[PDB]
Design a protein around this nucleic acid. Structure first.
Lengths: 55, 98, 87, 98, 79, 55
DNA sequence: CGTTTTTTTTTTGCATGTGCCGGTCTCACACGTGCCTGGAGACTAGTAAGCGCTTCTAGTGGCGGTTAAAACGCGGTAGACAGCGCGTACGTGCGTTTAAGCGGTGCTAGAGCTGTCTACGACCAATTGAGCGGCCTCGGCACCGGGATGCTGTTTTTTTTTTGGGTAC
DNA sequence: CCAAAAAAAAAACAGCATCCCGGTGCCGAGGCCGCTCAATTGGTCGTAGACAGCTCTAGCACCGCTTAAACGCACGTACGCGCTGTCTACCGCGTTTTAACCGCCACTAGAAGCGCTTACTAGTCTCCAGGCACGTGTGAGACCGGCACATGCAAAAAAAAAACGAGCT
């Protein structure tokens, strides 16, 4: 449902590994269910630390 | 000539690669490195192409997770530059490091 | 028996720009020098520890070919479970 | 008119308390805090004094362990005074919190 | 209400076995909210074993399984 | 063996939960083995950092 | 050059912890009984897997070319890091305050074991369609080139704060 | 008021790269088919676990006394923290070098599938001492207690590397 939402957010008809990661790692519950698990070709969420921005 | 400030292209690289999901180790060196290591336990072992991809997915992720843990320890010593002392730390709390 | 290939030292195949791209994804803006051979230390211990376990799986199964599936029973055993290669 | 220097007794208390194995939280104030929280999941509950003891052991031991890492995170920040941001960090890396 | 019972001099003593010299006063607060979160997690699961045995007395063996669940294995009570 | 030793070292003719705890974290291997284990009435090893000691 | 210094070694006196001599006490290790159930034994029964033979997947290795990524050097921005000063949040300690701990007793909720019964799942045989391996098509998504537009860094536009001589009050 | 000036800022112009577009191509999604085996139906048989009963363990309540511990306040020390000056490591960009990756090639190790044979372990029923619950004894370790001695701590003086002049060229 969320995987699909991300795919449709992405403008894609097809759910792809990225999309599974995107969904799981935004929902608090699923993330914590899949703590000790890796999601092949998922990368990571865009999380730059705000001390590393421009002055 | 044109010249961005130190840090500027570092930001764009973050955004560029955090966005994507494709492997950032060259699959050949890796394979040879996986083979080279595989030998130490027993020599003359064949590897499914999925098996060397399986490891190269496992390793590249683990490290991206380590660099997240590591970048905090550095900001947590008030710095921006990650360092040895940060990866040592991260691993120590993690208990991968006695 | 034996055939072409005996080992080599591919450790230095981890181009600096490779480890830099991992850290750029890992949210890192600035990277010390001492970093890139530090990472070569850890990444090496990782695989040794996975592949030891994966090789232990192949030897039980009396194959000479390590599968995708041998890697996974080990990776999980080492609490780093992977989705996208079966199991 | 004798006084010790801010720290030289803490270090004596450190030295001492590691050496020993007795439960450093008072047994009743805990046994109540066992009961208090437990009533939030189900009311009218009993407890084997051993299973109280079981929780004190694991909770003291847990925090002992966490203080060590939080100590390490605060040294890492050019400090000896530990802080809340040094707990927050050691759990974040421990994968207890986000 | 009973949260405090974990006294500021009690926390001090833990940290001193934790190898701590100097402690912010902000930490005594922090430690309670952590300790509470740990006992919640462990208790919750430990009762879940009790309510499935259908007892109303929680047992050493109910905590042991719930800690072992949370990664926290406890040698000493049953096992 | 390791704990029957640490009894001798504290002139003790009986092993206690400390003597095992010392035995086990003073063998790098067993330690690693019982890495996620919590021993009752164990206490920690004597260990203060360099930056905390006197000059 | 020989004056104020900090301040770095030196007794200096001081307080705890560690015993190593004593000595007394208590309860938990330690060991002994008695019986009961869980492992020993011998026979049977069935199939798991060890063995030999075959299939043919898929893992290896080598080429040759294209051009993307690895490498190396120069230059200067900017971030690490040390130094130093200013402020108070912590520790130390003795005095007052509380309530935990201890040993005890009184009470019964509920933990836990026992003998009975029957509902439900394993087990066993036949059926039969769910879901697999295989095959084939066409539209999603990779690829590319072109343009708009957001975004960085370098000039200029102006507009403050550390400072700065006149002016009445 | 009308200067700084320097710092700090605003925006104006100019430039670079990423985003989103249609125009293009192919291969992997998605489906349909035909077949094998694994899920279903039906029936039987054996026992898992539910239920009622009872025993009795241990968890809860309370109480009064003896400190051990918590609390509280006070005084000042040492450490958190900011600010600043310095110094070079790292990021940015470009020219130079490298071999990864592409699409294909042929080779064949060995992964995996089959069928048979058999030696191995479940499964039973009989028998019995290993190992349990129960119960008794006594010496280790708790617990002092004090002297003595070695460890480390907080002071208070005494030698040893700055600040402070005057004061020639």
């Amino acid at each position: 449902e969320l995987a699909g939402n991300a795919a449709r957010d992405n403008k894609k008809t097809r759910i792809i590994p990225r999309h599974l990661q995107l969904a799981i790692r935004n929902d608090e519950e699923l993330n914590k269910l899949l703590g000790r698990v890796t999601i092949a070709q998922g990368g990571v969420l865009p999380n730059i630390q705000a001390v590393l921005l421009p002055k | 000539p044109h010249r961005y400030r130190p840090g500027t292209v570092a930001l764009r690289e973050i955004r560029r690669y955090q966005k994507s999901t494709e492997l950032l180790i060259r699959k050949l060196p890796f394979q040879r490195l996986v083979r080279e290591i595989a030998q130490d336990f027993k020599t003359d072992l064949r590897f499914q192409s999925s098996a060397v991809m399986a490891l190269q997915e496992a390793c590249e992720a683990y490290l991206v997770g380590l660099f997240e843990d590591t970048n905090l320890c550095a900001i947590h010593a008030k710095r921006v530059t990650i360092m040895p002392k940060d990866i040592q730390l991260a691993r120590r709390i993690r208990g991968e490091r006695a | 028996k034996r055939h072409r290939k005996v080992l080599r030292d591919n450790i230095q195949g981890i181009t600096k720009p490779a480890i830099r791209r991992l850290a750029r994804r890992g949210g890192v803006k600035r990277i010390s020098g001492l970093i890139y051979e530090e990472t070569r230390g850890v990444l090496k211990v990782f695989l040794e520890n996975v592949i030891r376990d994966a090789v232990t799986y192949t030897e039980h199964a009396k194959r000479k070919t390590v599968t995708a599936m041998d890697v996974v029973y080990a990776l999980k055993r080492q609490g780093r479970t992977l989705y996208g290669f079966g199991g």
